[model samples]
Target: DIGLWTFRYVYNESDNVVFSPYGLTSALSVLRIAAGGNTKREIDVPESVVEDSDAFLALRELFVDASVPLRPEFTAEFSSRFNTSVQRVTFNSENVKDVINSYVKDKVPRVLDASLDRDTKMLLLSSVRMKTSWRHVFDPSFTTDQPFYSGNVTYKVRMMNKIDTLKTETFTLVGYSVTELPYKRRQTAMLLVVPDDLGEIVRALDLSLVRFWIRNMRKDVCQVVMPKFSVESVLDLRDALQRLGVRDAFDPSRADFGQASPSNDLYVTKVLQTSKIEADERGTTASSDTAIT
Candidate 1:
């Protein structure tokens, strides 16, 4: 719900709006666990849902300023239950950005370029990085410069050419197309949905409907011309969280942290998420002769 809500609020604000509702919900859900009174009531759920859903793997971390001050009990219990580690670092240090960026990169290289505002106090980094190779990889030799069209403009991009039999279906209900591309070993796959009217799907998109799309698809043979793509976006979700009735936490005067910390000044500062996604010829290499086969 937070993901959908964020898209509705942020869709028009940029050429590309990307953030994780799963990450946000998980972020606030933990906030609920960390606070009490009106703060907890507003969020309504806070029980390590993200941690629970770490099926494939999870890279969750919390970095608090050396002086942000968490109660001893809360810190111990949070660390005990969730997989994330808490480290006290100097948030005011000039090299703080590099410290965090390097730590996250070392954990999962080049997936993030994280930097915080000068005033940031506490930061939680939740990430999902999937470098799964395709079940059927694209041939790099067959990849060529192709024309991509949008409105009245034409742009040249590197496009992979393929004739794979894909899992596909057209949603007459929503007036769009869906193509499912399985990843290595099939633990998870990517679903590409295209709607002539993007708003139509936006208005109608929900969990069950998505399940319907996947359940209804059939094995299909089609010529697939897909552009190799990567996109990275950072979102400050304080406003969206506020609109979702998570208001009291952001308000310094009304904020409550009775259960998590003893500091009178403890409260939510900002909710931030940085996400990156890439699609490419990950399953094969140029050195391999299999593309010729």
Candidate 2:
């Protein structure tokens, strides 16, 4: 998977219940899916028709706070899920140093605390480790800043450059307002594009890519526009996932997750996805095929 999606919805359900936020379970859910596990929903969260639901949800929250910080008092019962099933090895950290030491022992893992400021309150949180292998590889030495056009304005973005030798252009079939990548991938690649102007891209995504990206992507050294920009995508997949035929997973009546309660009163209230992907202007490129298949 190129990237995962997640979210949160703070609702007033008759004033009797309130959803405070949580993160661990949500992240694990995404990890499970990546490891071929079906879905990694938290025990207490609402039924979101999500696979790696928690991580996507956390990403959703992060996306919302990227440029626009939330009020410090802004509180909600947030939950998260991951899609990877790889058995995660954990290290006991008594302090920050111990945690860092533990992370150093692993090939991929991280832990850190950071802050974001808003008008009223400061958003405090942990920065987790993220290391995903791309399906393709691009030459690293060749990177440059180029002008990228979004709608009308052109930003002088620091973009990765490439010169392809082959003449294949089927990626255009995937419907996005625009498409580009701005990173050097050793194994994986990020194909960034806006969903439709109307947001049908959510459903379009379910029916479209995933398997297609895993199947059709190829490597070529063509002139590529790899723009460096921070993109925020916040999506609500409740209706879209249902439309994709994962109804049972979202239904509170039939959902099998018992992690939250023995009575299983939990349901996927909402799947809120907030994400920010950014790249800095580096330099110019030499040339290589990087799109992973």
Top-scoring candidate (lDDT): 1
> How does model 1 fare in lDDT?
0.66
Q: For candidate 2, which ten residues in a row score worst on lDDT?
A: 284-293
Q: Write the per-residue lDDT of candidate 2 for residues 100-142, one digit (tens) a residue.
A: 3353344211212211112211111212222342223345566
> What is residue 190's positional error in candidate 1, in angstroms?
0.6
- Candidate 2 contains a number of clashing pairs equal to 74
Candidate 2 regions with alpha-carbon error over 4 angstroms: 1-168, 171-185, 191-220, 246-261, 281-293
lDDT against the true structure, per candidate, is 0.66, 0.33
Q: What is the TM-score of each candidate against the true structure?
A: 0.82, 0.38
Per-residue alpha-carbon lDDT of model 1 for 75-174, expressed as tens digits?
7877886645676778777777668767766653332333455566666665554456888888899999999776567889899988888888887655
Which RMSD values do the candidates have, in order?
A: 7.0, 14.1
